[PDB]
Design a protein around this ligand. Structure first.
Ligand SMILES: Cc1cc2nc3c(=O)[nH]c(=O)nc-3n(C[C@H](O)[C@H](O)[C@H](O)COP(=O)(O)O)c2cc1C
Ligand SMILES: Cc1cc2nc3c(=O)[nH]c(=O)nc-3n(C[C@H](O)[C@H](O)[C@H](O)COP(=O)(O)O)c2cc1C
Ligand SMILES: [Cl-]
Ligand SMILES: [Cl-]
Lengths: 168, 168
């Protein structure tokens, strides 16, 4: 009883190197629409997305973020943020939004990777500085994306030991 | 440039009423496999899933949880938990896992809803009591699921105001 949605979920992987080529505007638009389709605590919809295409900002962030060095080879990144003034579920909602973005990327032949901003205060401040985020808008993650430079197998993470019936 | 993965992301909605009929074992297995395919900070894979099919536990949880009353009409629920001893990203990883489970459910003609345990300490204690969770294993959410009782339109959440280019 498999299907294409499940295949995409199983196929998704973190891609950290990209070809030097742009990404179609229509694909970026669909990734954002995917992000906004996430579930949301009390249906607040606290997400805010910053689409970064400025070479200098991308490179400046790369230098300052410890595990987002691949920003220097990405043409674009989506910064998934939450309006913490509107919801204390923001980082949960925004994690579901981010996962939709990653799934969307995979489904359109792109590669992407979740790089943490939250929970690291210093990283969040980097992102705030370069994208001019109001104080209440907190960055969950920076998602570089592009066409993969080197296709890879997805990870096979199934682990029966992590399934518990009725009690632990 | 749409596709079936994006359609499923757009179609997913919270379903809170279910027909009185069981769910195929193969579907439940695929939902769990979907959950385990989530991305994970440092690839820790801190998720733990409790599949609850015991009528009494389901009903006892329903009584004690303020916004999971639909457990009394669900045959089963998946409790998404994180091993907080293994990862301080647990609630982010597990939110991505939960979103995969919801997407998987939708793709196989099922309905599901994320009901919060975390961040509410009292709810987390309810779940801990009934599923015997070790202290380090923290419950993110309780996901009742089933065949929908009343099909509904998905929510159309696209909001151009939540897209920012380069700076806020
Ligand atoms: C973090 C989180 C917590 C939620 N908590 C509950 C809950 O306790 N009970 C419930 O019925 N729905 C809960 N929901 C479901 C939301 O109400 C639902 O996602 C929102 O109304 C948007 O509707 P949709 O999922 O149909 O798109 C939760 C969703 C999220 C993301
Ligand atoms: C909460 C979270 C934070 C992450 N942080 C980073 C990061 O800062 N840099 C990075 O390259 N990858 C990061 N990752 C990606 C993970 O390393 C990746 O999901 C994991 O290795 C599993 O690989 P997969 O995504 O290919 O299945 C993060 C993932 C999650 C869920
Ligand atoms: Cl696997
Ligand atoms: Cl929409």
């Amino acid at each position: 009883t498999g299907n294409a949605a499940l295949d995409n979920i199983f196929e998704r992987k973190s891609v950290r190197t990209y070809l030097n080529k742009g990404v179609e505007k229509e694909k970026i638009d669909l990734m954002l629409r995917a992000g906004m389709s996430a579930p949301s605590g009390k249906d607040v919809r606290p997400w805010e997305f910053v689409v970064v295409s400025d070479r200098a900002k991308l490179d400046s962030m790369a230098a300052a973020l410890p595990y987002a060095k691949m920003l220097t080879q990405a043409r674009n990144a989506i910064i998934v943020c939450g309006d913490s003034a509107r919801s204390f579920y923001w980082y949960l909602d925004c994690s579901a939004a981010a996962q939709n973005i990653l799934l969307a990327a995979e489904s359109m032949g792109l590669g992407a990777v979740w790089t943490a901003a939250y929970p690291y205060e210093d990283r969040m401040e980097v992102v705030r500085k370069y994208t001019h985020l109001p104080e209440n808008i907190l960055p969950l993650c920076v998602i570089p994306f592009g066409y993969p430079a080197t296709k890879e197998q997805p990870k096979q993470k199934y682990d029966e030991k992590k399934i518990h019936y009725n009690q632990y």
